[PDB]
A paper describes a structure:
Human Shieldin consists of four subunits, [name] (also known as [name] or [name], 211 residues), SHLD1 (205 residues), [name] (835 residues), and [name] (250 residues). As the first identified member of the Shieldin complex, [name] is composed entirely of a HORMA domain, acting as an interaction module in a broad array of cellular pathways. The Shieldin complex acts as the key downstream effector of 53BP1; it not only binds and shields single-stranded DNA ends but also mediates CST- and Polα-dependent fill-ins of DNA breaks.
To test whether [name] can adopt a dimeric alignment in its complexes with SHLD peptides, we next designed a fusion protein containing an [name] fragment (residues 1 to 19) fused through a Gly–Ser linker to an [name] fragment (residues 1 to 58) and a C-terminal fragment of REV3 (residues 1887 to 1894) (labeled [name].3). The structure of this [name].3–Rev74 complex was solved at 3.8-Å resolution (X-ray statistics in SI Appendix) and is shown in two orientations. The [name].3 fusion protein serves as a strap with its N and C termini binding O-[name] and C-[name], respectively, therby strengthening the conformational heterodimerization of [name]. The 936 Å2 dimeric interface between O-[name] and C-[name] is further mediated by multiple intermolecular hydrophobic and hydrogen bonding interactions. Notably, Arg-124 of O-[name] forms hydrogen bonds with Ala-135 of C-[name], while Arg-124 of C-[name] forms hydrogen bonds with Glu-35 of O-[name], highlighting the importance of Arg-124, consistent with previous reports. The C-[name] forms the typical safety-belt including an intact β8′/β8″ hairpin, identical to that observed in the SHLD3s–[name] complex, while O-[name] lacks both the safety belt and the β8′ strand. The β1 strand of [name] is positioned between the β6 strand of O-[name] (antiparallel alignment) and the β1 strand of [name] (parallel alignment) as shown in Fig. 2 G and H, with this sandwiched β-sheet topology stabilized by hydrophobic and hydrogen bonding interactions.
Numbering used by the authors:
A (entry chain B): 12 to 106, 115 to 158, 199 to 208
B (entry chain A): 12 to 108, 114 to 208
C (entry chain X): 2 to 14, 33 to 91
The structure:
Amino acid sequence: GQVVADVLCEFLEVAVHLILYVREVYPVGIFQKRKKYNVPVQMSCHPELNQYIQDTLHCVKPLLEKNDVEKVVVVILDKEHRPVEKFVFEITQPPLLSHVEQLLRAFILKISVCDAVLDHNPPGCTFTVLVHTREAATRMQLYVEERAH
Amino acid sequence: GQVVADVLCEFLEVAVHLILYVREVYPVGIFQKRKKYNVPVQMSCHPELNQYIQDTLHCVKPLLEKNDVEKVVVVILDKEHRPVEKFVFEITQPPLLSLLSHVEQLLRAFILKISVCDAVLDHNPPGCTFTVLVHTREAATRNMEKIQVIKDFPWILADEQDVHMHDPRLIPLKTMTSDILKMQLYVEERAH
Amino acid sequence: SQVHIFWGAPIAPTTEVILHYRPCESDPTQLPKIAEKAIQDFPTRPLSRFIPWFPYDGSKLPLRPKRSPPAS
């Protein structure tokens, strides 16, 4: 079948992991360095967080396989349960390719530079995941929305 | 007195130690896991290297107290003494007219951003060395006596071979704004 | 049309709404009214463009320690 959806969620787990490590939600001492595609990522060694992310990507993966994927959003909520930061991931499917590994790294650099500018989050913040899809009358890249605070 | 130089020198010490670990300027066998600002860092256990880093920052400290520093750059040079990457710390100190663990909780993000440099930069050639460049606000020769605080650790003017890079790629890392401190950190990497 | 709110994450160790309640999670009171906040928009302050403060000026030479660090 179409295995491209199997690799996107594969590094989507990395992307959210990076955000959690980078948006300093809490002491990140749980993270450990592990290598995939000869690039290392700080992945949380907390089993419950990994289980939540794995169940998340396992439920979203077939939506990628059926071209039912419009946006993937990561929302940061303050202790008042109000959103402060939204990482929107818009995806447009084509309207071996393992040899192109440099773009797997360049995606990471785009998240890094997009974070390089935002302000520091309030303490005690948590997060949640959103998936937006659609199949009505239609008549990858990302951008971030930051709150005033 | 003016104490921001003490937290800056301790932050720069843990930053350079982590930079030497993440960029593999030295083998991993000389590094040990320590905790600073509630984050695991890799500190050097080499006595001469630790004394080298401490002597450097103890001399840079009085210029920070005087607020006579624009940027502090960590330059990694290849075996031909040519800069391949530069970690630029742009510094702005606004005037002043209350606890300061807020600064430590703020400086944590810069260390966390230095850790992802393993993922954004291509691996350096083997046998690289490093040096620290201080771009002063006032011309550097005016305040040369302010840094000669250690008798056996003299300071010199760098030359073009240590500083110049031909059209380097700019890699943003972190920006911080505060009532006490304004700091930016980015990387200038060679086109390779 | 479809929004898959994957509700989860712990703390300190008209379009259709497909919420993902999760198991014995039932304890932080009215979960749907909480999730109503996360789907809502907010006034976003547009991203600040990143620019360096002091570019590389060829006239102002920097300072350097005379010693080079020890090698392996």
